[PDB]
Symmetry: D3
Subunit: 241 residues, 6 copies
């Protein structure tokens, strides 16, 4: 049944790789992807949370933890070495540029005007532009790692759609400081700059690049399921708010 | 949270203008197959009944003869749906179906024919393609404006009532200057859509645009847009 | 005293001409201008409201009514004929393009969804673009009328500042229909399009052109007093929101 | 090799305003260096006067006709197709119809009688003219590709003038009305018709050599891979 | 509603960084003459006291030595005002007074001198002019952030507390590439201003920009901006 | 008059990359038609090899030097000022340093070792080069106005190349890194230094005649009132 939803937005037997694992949106996407039948490899530097995700939110048992710092270079060689031997191909890459980036936690409070003052006092404004570089840097090297596996997913033909790299990001603790939009757009500008350039140079291969920018769990499920599935095989270069 | 529950259009009372032709057709099919009462409007009942009795997979396609350009015919079709069902949740207006000439007479495949088409089309008809789309999206929403809010009050679906606006370029699609007519139509629906989105989204009605390419793409969009997936989709325009 | 406020934002003995008279903002500006000592001619097609303004809000008695339809062409020749003989020169022109434009009143209500429906039903969408043309058309011909008087205010030297044409507009009853911003930007686009072109061609003479776009009575007083006075003699081409 | 690079020898051009001005300044630079320039203007006395006066090699061919009426347009190419059967360059001056600043009083009445819709009308004519000018010469221009007398592709250089609106203080309004006019239509023709091997270019509105520089750089093989560009 | 009541700065506790020099000077004068307690900050007390004892018309100009680049000196001056007055309503930070070199040594009026200036200025100093302005506006607001809200709580003026940001291009003003340095400074203050305006206007603090030309113009702006006239002026940038 | 309009006779040019490429394609079109072209490159063996091989009239003068080091820059003009004392054209190739696509695996390691800050670095060098290239020749270029050997004003045409980054699949990144680089500095120089009688122009990054068309149209008197423009 061609346009029955169960066949259109089908991700059954899709081999995805999600950086950050739990993350924020990543979990919201990892849930929506495995639940509908997809091999979701989740990467993170804290294995206990990877293990929590793989066996508390997994509805069919396909979330596969893999410890590794995306920032860490050789750890990326390790993880590509692992998946190439276990599965040999991936179809989706959901890189969270800057999961190894901004501090995901702020010990100081943020409510009283004084708490806000010291938070600004210890935030050097160059850290906002650093958020940019972190996201630009990560998407570049994260895409670089899975480049063979990503096209390998084109040659194995387990899905009608093309291989895809969906890019996301987070601002970490900057979501709780009043100067959050500064960090948000600093992060958004990062992934879009790298994505547009990767799309121009590598969409000519079997990899389309897409962006989801940072709320309900159904908004992201809709997107990730429409984007990676057969329903969204002819969508490349877009940025979804 | 599985696809069958998220991208469900079950019990959606939609109204797709244009007469289930082209993008319109690909949308009524994808909506009815997955369970929606789709009223289809057009000025030629002969073609309206064919789709209902040829492409409907569950038999929930209800034809309705009417000129969208005619205001009184628009008043009638709203009058019909208000008593038969009393509420609509989706409106897929194809701005400019009562617009550009759908079928082209003269040959379009020769340097002379290309010249012949260029001489006999006044360039203001490109500006007219724009103007028609502004008129259609505006007046189609006005017709179903109460009916659409009834779709929030009957609460048969969690999503907000929605007006998806699209258009066609008619016979201009096989003239070498199609992009001109295309963007003329694209600009029409978007300009009016942002004016309606700004003015009426505060009334619980989302506005969205699908632009004038497999039936798999249109099904994806129309189903992602109208379902609970994509309940927080307002102001977007889809290429 | 050069930078004492009473001398900086001084409009004392300034000869202004305000189209619409009461208007909405026009009154708010006519009050701020005469109160601080300026000959304010007010123009409108309904003399009773011109007479009400001139002798209820006038604090020094300088609001001078003058009946006339700005849309009406020969009425403009009449009013320039009158002021050239009475005073012979003007320094400020506050034209409200489209005071002879959109309907300033809507008999139908606007609350119930049905009232909104019929209001849209009887509003042809071409009336929004007509709001544009009305404002573009009016500023052109309104400026045209006072062109001699405006430079006459440069030769008489009653103020250190240059002669000025401040342009405004209103959407009339469209302020009460839900599709108001459509009319607002339709009106704003009108005055700015004509203003930019008049500024390019005629700022090379002694007339700078400025725009105030459509709340408290002090916001407008601040603007009109800062703009037309000596404090704002080197401001041309700006658009004040 | 300036003489070989910028060769316009044997170029079949057609300029719709080669007597009005600029057209003239450019028909001269084109014929002098060896291009058969057909000249269009609605007052023929001046077109032939321009010829046998400004032809430095004697290759300037006048023909009476105004660009606004299309009945004149089939007339012109029907003749032009019979002499040569093919054109390579078209320098259309969209808006051939086109349209005492002393004392402010004269200026007041000067604009007092200029309806501002005439500026928007300056726009509309220019959009229509390039469209109908291209529509007229569409076969002949590609025929110039089949005769293969030049290495470059067929070209339509689009321009316009504001005429008497050049004198009113509100000239920039008319200039931009024309500037926006010719470019808007040019972008629609370039996307839709460059895929038929025809480049479109625009020169926007005064020296005898700056314009000559342009017309010769674009019409020569030097300007063979320049399409969609605009030039002041 | 007369000018003397609208454009009043009476009882305004302002703080103007840079040291009452240039636009800063023209602003402290226009503010004190019309009645405002203006604290002036700079790193050279000798020039700070001159303006206080030469250009003050009512004697309400209070000098304060301090490096705006030095954070601890910024902590001191805030500590001083918090006990002496306890509240500020206006902050006129001149971002990059502790920035570009104010005075130029070498001759600037010769093709050789122009070349000499071009060879000895690394082009990253233009990017540095930008970066300094981002740092100054950011950290100056951070210093007085509590103090500024006190100016809303003491209620000595109806307007909201305000941070007006400006800057200087230093010695680059008489180098032929001044516009480069000018816009480098202009971009600095505006980029940071919109980030502060977005983040902190919800705390009752307006942000505005005056860009780096008679003393009559600056008096007009600074007085229109800070007074009750212009109480609803936020997000603007003034050329 | 093609031969007189596009006259480059007796033009004192200086191209900083007239051996690398494009520079060569343009030094040729300039010297051949009579312009004394000084050529810069950091490997002199190839610069003199280009001369006495590509000089069609024998007017190509090499000089060893890399544009990045300014110590080389005073060296070059100190010599160039002594031979002639004045320059009219400067075609600077900002970024003279500049910088096996088979199989995806080679490509993975190819980018794996390219730090993305090197693309931003491609930008920075080009901004610095035009600045320091102009700073070097600033006196000599205006001296070319005082010698009055040409009717046109002195000109600095700015270009750059991405070198080996032209081969990585992410070349457009490097191209735009260079394209944005040269134009950003060019706009700052044009506003600040055109008031000193020096026009600035940019050609952005391959035929022997399309580039020749440009370099000759701009360097001639034809391109005398073209300043601030950019050309593909």
């Amino acid at each position: 049944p061609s346009l029955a939803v169960a066949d259109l937005f089908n991700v059954n037997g899709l081999v995805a790789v999600v950086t950050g694992g739990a993350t924020g949106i990543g979990l919201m996407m990892v849930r929506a992807l495995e639940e509908n039948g997809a091999k979701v490899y989740i990467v993170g530097r804290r294995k206990e949370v990877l293990e929590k995700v793989a066996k508390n939110e997994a509805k069919h048992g396909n979330i596969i933890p893999l410890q590794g710092d995306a920032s860490s270079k050789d750890d990326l060689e390790r993880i590509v070495a692992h998946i190439t031997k276990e599965t040999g191909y991936i179809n989706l890459l959901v890189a969270n540029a800057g999961i190894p980036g901004p501090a995901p936690i702020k010990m100081s409070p943020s409510s009283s005007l004084a708490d806000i003052q010291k938070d600004l006092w210890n935030t050097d404004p160059a850290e906002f532009e650093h958020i940019f570089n972190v996201h630009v840097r990560g998407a570049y090297f994260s895409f670089a790692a899975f480049l063979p596996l990503l096209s390998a997913g084109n040659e194995k033909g387990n899905v009608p759609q093309s291989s895809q790299m969906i890019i996301t990001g987070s601002i970490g603790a900057f979501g709780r400081v009043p100067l959050a939009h500064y960090a948000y757009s600093a992060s958004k500008a990062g992934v879009t700059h790298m994505a547009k350039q990767l799309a121009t140079a590598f969409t000519k291969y079997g990899i389309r690049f897409n962006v989801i920018a940072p709320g309900n769990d159904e908004d992201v499920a809709g997107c990730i399921l429409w984007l990676a599935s057969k329903a969204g095989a002819w969508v490349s270069g877009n940025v979804l708010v």
